[PDB]
Symmetry: D2
Subunit: 313 residues, 4 copies
Amino acid sequence: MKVTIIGASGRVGSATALLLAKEPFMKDLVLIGREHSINKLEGLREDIYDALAGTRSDANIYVESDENLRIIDESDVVIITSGVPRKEGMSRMDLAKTNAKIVGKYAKKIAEICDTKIFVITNPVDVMTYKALVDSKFERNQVFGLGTHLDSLRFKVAIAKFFGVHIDEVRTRIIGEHGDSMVPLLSATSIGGIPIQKFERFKELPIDEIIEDVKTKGEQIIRLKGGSEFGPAAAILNVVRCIVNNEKRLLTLSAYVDGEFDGIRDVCIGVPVKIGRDGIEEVVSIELDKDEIIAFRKSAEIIKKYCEEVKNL
Amino acid sequence: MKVTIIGASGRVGSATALLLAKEPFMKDLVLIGREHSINKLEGLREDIYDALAGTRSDANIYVESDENLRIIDESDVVIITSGVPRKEGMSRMDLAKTNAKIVGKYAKKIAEICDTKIFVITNPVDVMTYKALVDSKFERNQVFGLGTHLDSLRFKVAIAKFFGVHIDEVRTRIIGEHGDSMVPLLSATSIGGIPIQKFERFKELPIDEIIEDVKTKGEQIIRLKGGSEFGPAAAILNVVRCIVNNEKRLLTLSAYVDGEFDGIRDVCIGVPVKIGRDGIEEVVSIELDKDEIIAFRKSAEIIKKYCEEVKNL
Amino acid sequence: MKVTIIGASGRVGSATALLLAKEPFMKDLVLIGREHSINKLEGLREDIYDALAGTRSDANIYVESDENLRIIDESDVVIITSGVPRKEGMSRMDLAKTNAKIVGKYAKKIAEICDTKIFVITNPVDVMTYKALVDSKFERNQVFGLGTHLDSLRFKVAIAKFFGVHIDEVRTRIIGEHGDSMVPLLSATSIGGIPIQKFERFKELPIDEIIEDVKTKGEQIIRLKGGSEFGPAAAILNVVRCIVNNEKRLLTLSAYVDGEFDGIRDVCIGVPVKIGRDGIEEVVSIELDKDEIIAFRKSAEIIKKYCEEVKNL
Amino acid sequence: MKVTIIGASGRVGSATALLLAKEPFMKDLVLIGREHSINKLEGLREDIYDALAGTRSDANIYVESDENLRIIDESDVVIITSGVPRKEGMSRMDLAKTNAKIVGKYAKKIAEICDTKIFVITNPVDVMTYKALVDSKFERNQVFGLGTHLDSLRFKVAIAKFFGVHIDEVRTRIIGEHGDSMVPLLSATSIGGIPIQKFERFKELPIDEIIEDVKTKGEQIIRLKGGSEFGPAAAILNVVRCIVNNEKRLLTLSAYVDGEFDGIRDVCIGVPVKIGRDGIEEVVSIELDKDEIIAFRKSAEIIKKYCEEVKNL
Ligand SMILES: NC(=O)c1ccc[n+]([C@@H]2O[C@H](COP(=O)([O-])OP(=O)(O)OC[C@H]3O[C@@H](n4cnc5c(N)ncnc54)[C@H](OP(=O)(O)O)[C@@H]3O)[C@@H](O)[C@H]2O)c1
Ligand SMILES: NC(=O)c1ccc[n+]([C@@H]2O[C@H](COP(=O)([O-])OP(=O)(O)OC[C@H]3O[C@@H](n4cnc5c(N)ncnc54)[C@H](OP(=O)(O)O)[C@@H]3O)[C@@H](O)[C@H]2O)c1
Ligand SMILES: NC(=O)c1ccc[n+]([C@@H]2O[C@H](COP(=O)([O-])OP(=O)(O)OC[C@H]3O[C@@H](n4cnc5c(N)ncnc54)[C@H](OP(=O)(O)O)[C@@H]3O)[C@@H](O)[C@H]2O)c1
Ligand SMILES: NC(=O)c1ccc[n+]([C@@H]2O[C@H](COP(=O)([O-])OP(=O)(O)OC[C@H]3O[C@@H](n4cnc5c(N)ncnc54)[C@H](OP(=O)(O)O)[C@@H]3O)[C@@H](O)[C@H]2O)c1
């Protein structure tokens, strides 16, 4: 497999390449970055190689500037971690608009070379996955983002821990914006197959305190850290493994929806999809509950607003 | 960890010891059998050792006759595969009664040495797990059997395959007798967390044709095979891994129930339980549907009948 | 990958298919056998499927009689476990001659369909790998056998255990006949890279007692066992993994040698080779010691004798 | 197992904690750092937890300032990555002396709390492992460093790649200073067990060009990178796994030697040792070649010089 990472120099970009180089399926890992951060990549390539010293690996790592993405052709998927590390004076709209030009820039540049899967990690993930789709001019099945996938795993752990059951016995998810307006679906949450609602202990699940932490895990940023390292990479790797192996998992990624959920059209948002060797092979439409769909409505509304301000940058 | 297998000479006993010797947690594997089949075990020990040649392992394999189970003390769990390979003239009651004396025999002999977990594999698994419990005089949390666990995985595969979703995205189970009266619970079956009922395609799930095959997988026996080899061993290993690692999974094993499910008392049957380092740490009681509990009632009735005929052998 | 096993019904054949079905690289596993043992295979297929219940696998298992090997075309490798379970009255020459017709039979039948790698397991492994090569009319790089590979791992364990070092820190091997005339090469035996000879404790290595056990591990047969189950399968799986993944390992398999070792020509014997995606890609010729080559000479002599008696059957 | 990392905030410290938290054997991971970098650790703890989201783990992560190492008691091993990131004006002696006070500081502080294994990563690794030993006042078996272990793996890859053999078929090592004076031992280098010298292609092994790169991999630092990230962490994890599992591997770590190699006394240097549950359980003394021991003599001389300047800081 051939994966390309755009922004392999950043924390997540680095962590992600590391994990991807260890994969048996990784044949050509292309680390792309701007002309001035090319030494940091070659520095990364040498570092990764050390971490692989002793284990079998045919991972060919390549480094290039974001000028001639020619080498990125035939990539099974192209990840994008590029983006401005936010900033004090920066506002949500201010942040949206900025990375928009960065993701779009790459989206377009990529699109010229070929048709590949664009896995958008940079924030606002939804608004950015939207942008990449618009500027890439790709099919809705080729562009998706990390969305609420990690928030979902984060919600899964909390619950499994609350009930004292093996992590695997739980399956839940958060749909909507990968932000304050994210919607947790307890209607699609089972404990060992059994709807969480069929358990007494459920009535005592600190759902609000829990969502609060999930929602605000942007505390990696504030908590003396750049913003995120391994958390994301770990998720990304999973999603890539899902694609290359055509796993057909029912993840919750930021994908383009259009009616699958009544009242939600023309917007990239965190929704359940079936991921396989062809990207977002389906936007699973299941009946939510009264308030879940009301809340899922408001979330998309928020996101759409930004999508407009960005659609033409 | 110290596991003992009673019947390590049979197909399943052999396959199971093989898999268990490869486990990092296996410290002392005791293979027990009758005086005349001791050469087959030492023959097994040497064989397993070959399969381990090249891989790290501190698995001490021991062989002994079923006369002085002294060596089986301090075992974390004792598996029992011993039993008559059924027979043409043999009837269900005829078969029940026979293995009953075999499992009970061991149950009692084991009980004398110490208090351990007794994992009963021999059939009728439910009726035999019941017997082992009665003759072992152990706590309901220390005696359980394979029950409908493999039938559950078997049902899981079929479904995941019917919907074309990753095996992991499905969680379902069959409660009741590990036989013709087994009950599939589609009320505790989720696809990616979503109740299977919330999918249109569900309406077309060949639930009857499917259960038929699961139910009658006693075709290993008839289909030019002794009766089962790896299928079971693979399951057993999982369940053991679940215990040693205190996984806290919500499996469906043959355990002693008593009211957890209204209308079901004094019987060992396939029911959902929370398995950990202390065996059946809980018999999860969830509200079934109208017919699931009606059918679960009839199953237990059947099983109980046999339990009586065996209670004092 | 597409592997075919000829004799999937035997102990090793069964164990091997089990292990191979679990491999991520196994796409189509063809289990071939005679018309009367077709139910035992379908019985095996169903059993294996149970052991896979719960884990991802795209392993398509197929069953067919040894009449129309048409289905075995495009197989990356074809394993052969078919053979007479030896017998009391049977003599080495008697045994050689018999399986010769069986392996040759299949060799020829396979050859007609296509050009594939023939991995010969049945004994006498050397004499049988020779035969399969002769009757298959394949290139010396496409036909090889288990030879002294397991005897080598067996020797490795013994040593590592004698020095009290991690299994991985040892690399040794036995060349020659997979029989009484096998030759252990302590000249190609390192402990952590260091020639075993550079260790004082070496002087006390029970090399003779050790080789005796290795040599006579045909005690699985006598020790109340058919003859071997998992030991072999475990090895086979490794060797197949080596091929499919073009590992380029320096194993010790029964391959066709012709001068690589001075004084050893026109014979299939246990010798060091470089295994990859193209089979025996090289018969590594390293200078042995005075007696190692003298002993390696006698071994080949023995084997050759049988090869003649079989060359035209 | 309880591991403590001193400097969990640095690149290697972070990467290492990540890898260690994923280990099944990791029960309590203590991340220690100075009062001002405590938010970076809690930020790390939250990040790691995200990378673990979905996988089983009982890894309790703890964060504390380097004031009251009370919590670090009962640690199976304490890793030390603390140290000054070198500097332009800084000279080898200047660098040695500085980190000396840092490692020694911690060494002493640790020693007060209890007797544990001190795994010294900070440079100069040899001179620093020496210091930690001196200020910890521990037994020579409890203090060791990364030394030439990664340089050894680095040499292993290069070779295996030069011969086109599976990575596992090679075992070589570099003894001496983890610096310009490092000594490669081709006398303890086997290819598939066979002394590398017994291969013709060996005569063409670019041993000098190769060692040059290994030696100067301090190019991570210069090549737009802090200095090293995953390379080290990957190694460290291995060495820890080696300890917790009492693997008994013959690694090449920076340990205290005293005569094991004639002409080498009172110095911590990269030498072959047997690592197990008790640390450096033996300093393997094998006869080197004429020049290997001459070169190994000069290396130790260099290192000793620094050890003096540091012995009392
Ligand atoms: N999903 C989550 O939970 C989560 C959490 C935190 C952060 N994030 C997002 O994921 C990314 C993580 O960032 P990080 O830790 O990797 O490091 P960083 O320093 O925030 O970002 C480094 C990356 O941004 C690129 N970049 C910076 N300025 C640029 C510009 N003007 N034009 C184009 N590219 C530019 C860099 O490329 P060059 O080297 O070529 O400049 C590099 O690829 C961000 O986009 C962030 O918004 C997601
Ligand atoms: N859950 C499932 O899906 C499933 C499927 C098939 C079978 N099974 C059950 O699992 C077991 C599988 O049998 P198998 O393939 O391992 O081989 P087998 O030949 O059916 O059984 C061999 C075992 O039975 C013991 N045994 C035979 N006669 C005995 C006697 N009179 N007293 C005490 N022990 C006796 C043997 O012990 P000695 O060597 O000491 O005689 C050995 O441990 C059976 O009990 C069977 O009912 C379960
Ligand atoms: N490396 C070692 O140390 C070691 C040790 C022991 C054994 N082994 C090897 O491992 C294998 C063990 O044998 P096993 O457990 O597989 O069972 P087995 O009973 O020895 O062999 C069964 C196989 O032989 C076939 N067969 C028997 N008679 C035949 C005939 N007249 N014509 C054609 N095919 C015939 C069977 O086909 P049907 O079912 O169609 O009849 C079946 O495929 C052997 O091949 C042996 O060489 C290796
Ligand atoms: N084997 C190889 O080839 C190789 C190559 C390169 C590097 N490495 C090693 O790997 C490590 C890389 O360093 P890094 O990424 O961890 O980050 P770094 O910036 O080099 O070191 C950070 C650590 O040093 C501590 N520290 C800094 N100044 C200190 C002082 N004055 N007193 C006490 N502690 C002080 C920090 O504590 P606070 O955060 O509390 O200040 C933190 O724990 C080094 O130890 C180096 O020796 C090995």
